[PDB]
C-alpha cells in the first residue's frame, strides 16, 4: 500500500559490509535492525525511521531516513547515526544515503562531536 | 527509567520557530510530531527516532536522532530530514543538532538532492 | 572593486574564539591566516579561498569558502578543514558557515575521516 | 618536495564527469581550475586550496581541500563549493571528498542555503 513499501522491505547491505533489515509500513514507518561491519559496534541495534509513502511518479527516488542509537545489550558507544537518502527501484535497486554520526561530548568538545559520511545500500553482497 | 527520559520528553522549539513534541521511551525510543515554521510544510508530521538511554556520567551530552518524512494529510514535499545531535540537560537545557534533508530526485539530479544545516532546540520560545 | 571586497577584508572571530584574518581580492581571491582556539592547533595557519565578487543585488548574502590545512611550523595534525558559507553585510556583519574537517586515515578507517560543523564569524569578540 | 606534490599535480575526473586541474606547491598550496559536468556552470572556474605537504608515513591518506566560487566570465551562480578530503596514492590513485555548496540567500532562506555531497576523483575517465 505505500508505493515502495514492497521495494524497501527486506535486507540491504552497504559498501562496508553492514546489514540493514527493515520493514516499511503502509503509512510511512520504517522499523528494523542494523548491524555495522565497522566501529565500536557488535551485533544488532534497533532502528526506526520514515519514508515518503506516495513519491513523485516522474522517475524520482523515494525520500527516507532512519536512526540508530549505538546502545544494545552488548555495547554502548554513546552515539547515534542518522541516514538521510533516497530509494531508487529497478533491477539494480539502491538506497543512496548521507549520514551524521553524533557522539555525546562535553560542551568543550562539542565542536568535534559529529562525523559525516555516505553509504550506498544494495540488495546483494 | 532512561537517564534523560524525563529531560527529553516534551515540547521543544528551534531558532526558526519550529516545534518538536517528543516522548522518550525507557528503552531508547523517540516518538512524536514536528511542525516546521519554514518551507513546504503545513501542520504536524510524524517523527520517530532513538536516543542513548544510558549516557556517560562525566558531563557528556546524550546522543540522539530522529526523522521526519515530509508527507502528511495536507502536503507531500517528497523529502525527509534527519537530525543528529545531543541533549544537554540543566537550567538551560538544549538539543544541539545537525540535519540532512534529502529530496527525491531523478538520477541526473541526485548530486543536488541533500541540504545540510543545524538547529538548536530549547524548552522556551 | 569586488562588491564586498571591503566588507570581507579584515579580522573575524567565531563562537569558539578562533581568529580568521583575510584579504579579499578584486577578482574573487581570499588569502590570509587562521588561528584555532580549539584542537590540535597552535599559532597561525595559511588559508586560501574564493568569494563571489559580483553577488545578487536583492539582499542575498555573498557566497564564499576557504581551506586551512593544519600544518605549520609548530604542528601537523594531518588534517584540513574547508568552510563554505555566506557573508552578510550591515551593522552586525557576519560570515555564516558550515565546515568539513578531513583527517588523513587508512582505507579501513576512512569511513570515520570527516567531522562536520558550523561556525559563525563576527567582527567583534 | 611536498610528499605528494607529484601524486596530486595534474588532471582528475569525478563520477559526474567533471574535470579538476590542479598544481600542488611544495609548501601546501593548491591552484588550478575546475569544470563541472553538471549544474549552472560553463567552462573553467578558478580554484584554490591547501594540502598536508608532510603526511603521516603509516599508509594514511593526505588531507586536502579546495574552493571554487561559481563566477567566471560566462556565468555567475552566486555560489561556492568547498571539497574536503584525502588523496590516496598507488596504482589506482584517488581523491575521496565530501563537499559543501553554499548559495547566497536572503536571511529568510538561509536555512536552505547549503547542499552536501561526495565526489570521488580518479586519474582516468
Residue numbers in the entry:
A (entry chain A), B (entry chain A), C (entry chain A), D (entry chain A): 10 to 134
Publication excerpt:
Two rounds of directed evolution afforded the double mutant S112M–K121A that displayed a 36-fold increase in surface activity vs. cellular background and a 5.7-fold increased in vitro activity compared to the wild type enzyme. To our delight, [CpRu(QA-Biot)(OH2)] 3·Sav-S112M–K121A afforded high resolution diffraction data. The crystals were obtained by sitting drop vapor diffusion, followed by soaking with cofactor [CpRu(QA-Biot)(OH2)] 3 and flash freezing in liquid nitrogen (see ESI†). The [CpRu(QA-Biot)(OH2)] 3 cofactor was modeled with 100% occupancy within the Sav biotin binding site. The piperazine linker and the ruthenium carboxyquinoline moiety are localized in a single conformation within the biotin vestibule. The aromatic quinoline ring is stabilized by a methionine–π interaction with the neighboring S112M side chain. The aliphatic side chains of L124 and L124* (* indicates the neighboring Sav monomer) and the carbonyl moieties of residues K121A and S122 form a pocket that harbors the quinoline ligand. Spherically-shaped electron density around the ruthenium suggests that the cofactor may exist as a mixture of epimers (i.e. (R)- and (S)-Ru). The Cp and water ligands were thus not modeled due to the ambiguity of the electron density. X-ray crystallography of ADAse double mutant S112M–K121A highlights the localization of cofactor 3 within the biotin-binding vestibule.
